[PDB]
Amino acid sequence: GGLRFGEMERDCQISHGCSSVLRERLFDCSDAYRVIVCDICGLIAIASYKKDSYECRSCQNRTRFSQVYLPYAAKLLFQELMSMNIAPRLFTKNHK
């Protein structure tokens, strides 16, 4: 595999109106990837999803956190941005 889900293709779900099919065939059926974001400066943490240890060597956080679904696709880009010294803060809900 796999197949191929063109730009063309996606523009057609949108016509019908399938939020969920769309979301399923792009952020699930390909890159099902989850990461954990700091609430102040929205960035990858020192997450462990085992010993509930998150911690943040910067904003000094250990209690305030939120989780985000992103494609490893997305992941790379945000990371690749870090190398260009720019910080896409993912300011989630009130967790801002």
């Binding site: 523009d11 057609c12 949108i14 016509s15 109106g17």
Partner: protein, 258 residues
Amino acid sequence: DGLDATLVEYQVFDSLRLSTKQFEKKYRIDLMEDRSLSLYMENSIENDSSVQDLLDEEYTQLVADRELLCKFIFPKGDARWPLPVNVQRIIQNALQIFHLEAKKPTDLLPSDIINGLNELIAKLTIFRGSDRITRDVQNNATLLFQILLRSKFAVKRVIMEYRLNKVAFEWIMGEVEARFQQAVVSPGEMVGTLAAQSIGEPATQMTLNTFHYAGVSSKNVTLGVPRLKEILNVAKNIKTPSLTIYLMPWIAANMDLA
């Protein structure tokens, strides 16, 4: 419009390309050496009872008439336009469901069909609600669909042409109401995406043709597709910049004057 493109059927306005002379011979009614309907009023005439009726008959036409003049004043000459809910059909088939031929005159009443509408046009709402003044966007967001329902259900029409009865009529105005609200688009929705896609397919159908084969030609020249981009690009240099200018006349309707 306010409606979902996908549920619509081009329709026709009988009441348009008609001579005033024959217009009157379809909707207008009076007691002046007429009273021909009484032959249909069966069963039950009244007869004529006391005022009221005589008065409803000229009030219906006051509005069926403010509709004949406007349009036009808005539409060139065409008549075929796409409206929601095929009315010309809800009546046939409808004269299949109940049948009843000329032999059976109408168990209705001129004071009903007129109430019939007023109560079931005001059931066709698509902008909610009132919220006064917000009822305006609605009164004329269906204004076109409306002049239909006073042209195919105006009084003289339901007793001269295709005699109806309480049950039939009550059922007709049923499907309409229903087929209408079932035709209201969205919310949702994405009206641009779908619409945009449909606009692209059409161009592709032209491009080829505009070239096919195909000459060879002169004057009016312009071309299709190849031009599209020009319009979207709002570019100054649009090959065929053309421009059509009309006259009066005069001047002119002649020739040598022109």
